[PDB]
Design a protein around this motif. Structure first.
Motif, PDB file in Angstrom:
ATOM      1  N   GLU A 199       0.815  -1.211   0.000  1.00  0.00           N
ATOM      2  CA  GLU A 199       0.000   0.000   0.000  1.00  0.00           C
ATOM      3  C   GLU A 199       0.851   1.265   0.000  1.00  0.00           C
ATOM      4  O   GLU A 199       0.416   2.295  -0.525  1.00  0.00           O
ATOM      5  CB  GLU A 199      -0.938  -0.003   1.202  1.00  0.00           C
ATOM      6  CG  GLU A 199      -1.919  -1.138   1.232  1.00  0.00           C
ATOM      7  N   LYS A 200       2.070   1.220   0.567  1.00  0.00           N
ATOM      8  CA  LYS A 200       2.937   2.386   0.639  1.00  0.00           C
ATOM      9  C   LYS A 200       3.959   2.465  -0.495  1.00  0.00           C
ATOM     10  O   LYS A 200       4.770   3.401  -0.526  1.00  0.00           O
ATOM     11  CB  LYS A 200       3.670   2.431   1.996  1.00  0.00           C
ATOM     12  CG  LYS A 200       2.745   2.393   3.219  1.00  0.00           C
ATOM     13  CD  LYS A 200       1.837   3.615   3.203  1.00  0.00           C
ATOM     14  CE  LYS A 200       2.641   4.881   3.117  1.00  0.00           C
ATOM     15  NZ  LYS A 200       1.673   6.020   3.290  1.00  0.00           N
ATOM     16  N   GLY A 201       3.967   1.502  -1.419  1.00  0.00           N
ATOM     17  CA  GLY A 201       4.902   1.561  -2.524  1.00  0.00           C
ATOM     18  C   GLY A 201       6.203   0.827  -2.311  1.00  0.00           C
ATOM     19  O   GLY A 201       7.233   1.225  -2.875  1.00  0.00           O
ATOM     20  N   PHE A 202       6.190  -0.217  -1.490  1.00  0.00           N
ATOM     21  CA  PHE A 202       7.384  -0.994  -1.170  1.00  0.00           C
ATOM     22  C   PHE A 202       7.019  -2.454  -1.199  1.00  0.00           C
ATOM     23  O   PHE A 202       5.859  -2.833  -1.029  1.00  0.00           O
ATOM     24  CB  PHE A 202       7.961  -0.652   0.225  1.00  0.00           C
ATOM     25  CG  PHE A 202       8.464   0.770   0.325  1.00  0.00           C
ATOM     26  CD1 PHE A 202       9.749   1.087  -0.025  1.00  0.00           C
ATOM     27  CD2 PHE A 202       7.613   1.795   0.727  1.00  0.00           C
ATOM     28  CE1 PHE A 202      10.229   2.381   0.027  1.00  0.00           C
ATOM     29  CE2 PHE A 202       8.083   3.105   0.754  1.00  0.00           C
ATOM     30  CZ  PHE A 202       9.381   3.398   0.435  1.00  0.00           C
ATOM     31  N   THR A 203       8.024  -3.292  -1.391  1.00  0.00           N
ATOM     32  CA  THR A 203       7.824  -4.719  -1.304  1.00  0.00           C
ATOM     33  C   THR A 203       8.903  -5.290  -0.399  1.00  0.00           C
ATOM     34  O   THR A 203      10.086  -4.934  -0.531  1.00  0.00           O
ATOM     35  CB  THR A 203       7.835  -5.365  -2.695  1.00  0.00           C
ATOM     36  OG1 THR A 203       7.587  -6.761  -2.546  1.00  0.00           O
ATOM     37  CG2 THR A 203       9.161  -5.121  -3.380  1.00  0.00           C
ATOM     38  N   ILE A 204       8.465  -6.089   0.566  1.00  0.00           N
ATOM     39  CA  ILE A 204       9.326  -6.683   1.591  1.00  0.00           C
ATOM     40  C   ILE A 204       9.353  -8.186   1.378  1.00  0.00           C
ATOM     41  O   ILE A 204       8.300  -8.828   1.210  1.00  0.00           O
ATOM     42  CB  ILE A 204       8.824  -6.342   3.009  1.00  0.00           C
ATOM     43  CG1 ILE A 204       8.961  -4.832   3.259  1.00  0.00           C
ATOM     44  CG2 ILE A 204       9.586  -7.199   4.063  1.00  0.00           C
ATOM     45  CD1 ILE A 204       8.299  -4.405   4.581  1.00  0.00           C
ATOM     46  N   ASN A 205      10.550  -8.766   1.376  1.00  0.00           N
ATOM     47  CA  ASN A 205      10.631 -10.227   1.441  1.00  0.00           C
ATOM     48  C   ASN A 205      11.636 -10.600   2.531  1.00  0.00           C
ATOM     49  O   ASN A 205      12.028  -9.773   3.367  1.00  0.00           O
ATOM     50  CB  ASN A 205      10.948 -10.859   0.068  1.00  0.00           C
ATOM     51  CG  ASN A 205      12.294 -10.440  -0.502  1.00  0.00           C
ATOM     52  OD1 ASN A 205      13.186 -10.013   0.220  1.00  0.00           O
ATOM     53  ND2 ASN A 205      12.455 -10.571  -1.832  1.00  0.00           N
ATOM     54  N   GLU A 206      12.056 -11.872   2.546  1.00  0.00           N
ATOM     55  CA  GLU A 206      12.958 -12.324   3.611  1.00  0.00           C
ATOM     56  C   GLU A 206      14.306 -11.617   3.576  1.00  0.00           C
ATOM     57  O   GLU A 206      14.996 -11.567   4.604  1.00  0.00           O
ATOM     58  CB  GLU A 206      13.162 -13.851   3.506  1.00  0.00           C
ATOM     59  CG  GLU A 206      14.312 -14.413   4.327  1.00  0.00           C
ATOM     60  CD  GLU A 206      14.554 -15.903   4.115  1.00  0.00           C
ATOM     61  OE1 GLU A 206      13.671 -16.600   3.561  1.00  0.00           O
ATOM     62  OE2 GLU A 206      15.642 -16.369   4.516  1.00  0.00           O
ATOM     63  N   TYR A 207      14.680 -11.056   2.430  1.00  0.00           N
ATOM     64  CA  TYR A 207      16.020 -10.562   2.133  1.00  0.00           C
ATOM     65  C   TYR A 207      16.138  -9.048   2.075  1.00  0.00           C
ATOM     66  O   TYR A 207      17.190  -8.498   2.471  1.00  0.00           O
ATOM     67  CB  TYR A 207      16.456 -11.119   0.781  1.00  0.00           C
ATOM     68  CG  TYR A 207      16.266 -12.576   0.692  1.00  0.00           C
ATOM     69  CD1 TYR A 207      17.130 -13.443   1.361  1.00  0.00           C
ATOM     70  CD2 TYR A 207      15.223 -13.103  -0.065  1.00  0.00           C
ATOM     71  CE1 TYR A 207      16.962 -14.821   1.265  1.00  0.00           C
ATOM     72  CE2 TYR A 207      15.033 -14.471  -0.156  1.00  0.00           C
ATOM     73  CZ  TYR A 207      15.918 -15.323   0.505  1.00  0.00           C
ATOM     74  OH  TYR A 207      15.773 -16.675   0.428  1.00  0.00           O
ATOM     75  N   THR A 208      15.122  -8.369   1.525  1.00  0.00           N
ATOM     76  CA  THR A 208      15.277  -6.961   1.160  1.00  0.00           C
ATOM     77  C   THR A 208      13.954  -6.219   1.320  1.00  0.00           C
ATOM     78  O   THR A 208      12.876  -6.816   1.414  1.00  0.00           O
ATOM     79  CB  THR A 208      15.736  -6.782  -0.304  1.00  0.00           C
ATOM     80  OG1 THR A 208      14.713  -7.292  -1.178  1.00  0.00           O
ATOM     81  CG2 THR A 208      17.059  -7.488  -0.578  1.00  0.00           C
ATOM     82  N   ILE A 209      14.054  -4.895   1.374  1.00  0.00           N
ATOM     83  CA  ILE A 209      12.903  -4.037   1.107  1.00  0.00           C
ATOM     84  C   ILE A 209      13.256  -3.194  -0.107  1.00  0.00           C
ATOM     85  O   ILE A 209      14.371  -2.653  -0.196  1.00  0.00           O
ATOM     86  CB  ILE A 209      12.505  -3.144   2.303  1.00  0.00           C
ATOM     87  CG1 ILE A 209      11.316  -2.247   1.915  1.00  0.00           C
ATOM     88  CG2 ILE A 209      13.657  -2.353   2.799  1.00  0.00           C
ATOM     89  CD1 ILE A 209      10.605  -1.577   3.158  1.00  0.00           C
ATOM     90  N   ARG A 210      12.320  -3.132  -1.063  1.00  0.00           N
ATOM     91  CA  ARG A 210      12.512  -2.468  -2.343  1.00  0.00           C
ATOM     92  C   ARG A 210      11.335  -1.548  -2.620  1.00  0.00           C
ATOM     93  O   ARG A 210      10.207  -1.881  -2.275  1.00  0.00           O
ATOM     94  CB  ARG A 210      12.614  -3.501  -3.475  1.00  0.00           C
ATOM     95  CG  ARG A 210      13.841  -4.394  -3.352  1.00  0.00           C
ATOM     96  CD  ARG A 210      13.837  -5.530  -4.366  1.00  0.00           C
ATOM     97  NE  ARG A 210      12.800  -6.516  -4.111  1.00  0.00           N
ATOM     98  CZ  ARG A 210      12.472  -7.475  -4.968  1.00  0.00           C
ATOM     99  NH1 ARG A 210      13.078  -7.586  -6.143  1.00  0.00           N
ATOM    100  NH2 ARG A 210      11.538  -8.354  -4.629  1.00  0.00           N
ATOM    101  N   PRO A 211      11.557  -0.419  -3.285  1.00  0.00           N
ATOM    102  CA  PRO A 211      10.408   0.341  -3.797  1.00  0.00           C
ATOM    103  C   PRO A 211       9.712  -0.438  -4.917  1.00  0.00           C
ATOM    104  O   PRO A 211      10.335  -1.234  -5.627  1.00  0.00           O
ATOM    105  CB  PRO A 211      11.041   1.643  -4.285  1.00  0.00           C
ATOM    106  CG  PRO A 211      12.450   1.271  -4.627  1.00  0.00           C
ATOM    107  CD  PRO A 211      12.846   0.152  -3.687  1.00  0.00           C
ATOM    108  N   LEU A 212       8.386  -0.254  -5.033  1.00  0.00           N
ATOM    109  CA  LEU A 212       7.582  -0.987  -6.012  1.00  0.00           C
ATOM    110  C   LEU A 212       6.690  -0.023  -6.782  1.00  0.00           C
ATOM    111  O   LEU A 212       5.785   0.577  -6.195  1.00  0.00           O
ATOM    112  CB  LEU A 212       6.723  -2.049  -5.333  1.00  0.00           C
ATOM    113  CG  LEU A 212       6.022  -3.022  -6.304  1.00  0.00           C
ATOM    114  CD1 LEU A 212       7.035  -3.870  -7.049  1.00  0.00           C
ATOM    115  CD2 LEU A 212       5.026  -3.917  -5.589  1.00  0.00           C
ATOM    116  N   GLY A 213       6.904   0.083  -8.113  1.00  0.00           N
ATOM    117  CA  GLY A 213       6.145   1.021  -8.930  1.00  0.00           C
ATOM    118  C   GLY A 213       4.740   0.532  -9.283  1.00  0.00           C
ATOM    119  O   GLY A 213       4.365  -0.607  -9.022  1.00  0.00           O
TER     120      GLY A 213
END
Length: 246
Positions: A199-213
């Motif tokens: 919802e805030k424009g990011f994607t989190i997995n076990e390894y990283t947090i990344r911005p998501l367009g």
């Protein structure tokens, strides 16, 4: 069929024996712990150690003992190299009054995600814990994961504590706190936090947090030097681990 199923279900309580291997054992007339002990030649190492500690591994670990175990682990790791960082995760970190096992996440600034394998960063820690008689057995040891057995030192009269399951996982430093977040859970909390990140424009997995367009393309991993940094990116108040049931 009832007795056949009960036999299969019994053997599956041994760590290292999954449903398929249990079915094969029972088809061979191997049904009880006594049968397993008489047929050690049919077991792999993990199964043999799981049989060795069958009763102990069905006991829970009181938080008081987890805190003792944690101090032994943390003190010995610091003795090997003060730049190691180690965190006990799982429901222990969320404040649980008992645990099923101890799950340790380990990193070192020498080990990043651009690194090839450095198994001795893990093995040196295992070796030190074996040297002080805390780790007593190994179930399996790989380049980044150790699964084994440990035991608190006897405190009085030579009386022994139960042997306990312990896992130690070596994680790249630049992925460490995302790992700590993931392995602290709960599973439902992880799902809810990953949904808020989207919802805030990011994607989190076990390894990283990344911005998501808006097209669904993830950008480069963002720098994370604490668990708090991940909450900061998605503009959430820091959720203490005791508040992560959902």
């Amino acid at each position: 069929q009832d007795d056949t199923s009960s036999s299969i279900n019994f053997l599956t309580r041994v760590t290292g024996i999954g449903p398929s291997a249990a079915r094969k054992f029972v088809d061979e007339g191997i049904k009880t712990l006594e049968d397993l002990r008489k047929n050690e030649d049919k077991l792999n190492h993990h199964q043999r150690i799981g049989l060795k500690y069958f009763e102990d591994f069905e006991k829970r670990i009181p938080r008081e003992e987890m805190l003792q175990m944690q101090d032994i682990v943390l003190n010995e790791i610091k003795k090997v190299d003060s730049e190691y960082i180690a965190t006990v995760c799982g429901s222990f970190r969320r404040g649980a009054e008992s645990s099923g096992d101890m799950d340790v996440l380990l990193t070192h600034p020498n080990f990043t995600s651009e690194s090839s394998k450095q198994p001795k960063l893990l093995h040196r820690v295992v070796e030190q814990l074996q040297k002080v008689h805390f780790i007593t057995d190994t179930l399996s040891k790989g380049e980044t994961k150790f699964m084994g057995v440990c035991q608190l030192p006897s405190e009085k009269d030579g009386k022994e504590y139960p042997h306990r399951r312990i896992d130690i996982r070596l994680i790249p430093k630049d992925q460490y706190y995302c790992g700590v977040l993931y392995f602290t859970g709960s599973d439902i909390f992880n799902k809810n936090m990953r949904a808020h990140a989207l919802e805030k424009g990011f994607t989190i997995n076990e390894y990283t947090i990344r911005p998501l367009g808006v097209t669904g393309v993830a950008g480069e991993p963002l720098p994370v030097d604490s668990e708090q940094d991940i909450f900061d990116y998605i503009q959430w108040r820091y959720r203490e681990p005791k508040d992560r049931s959902e």
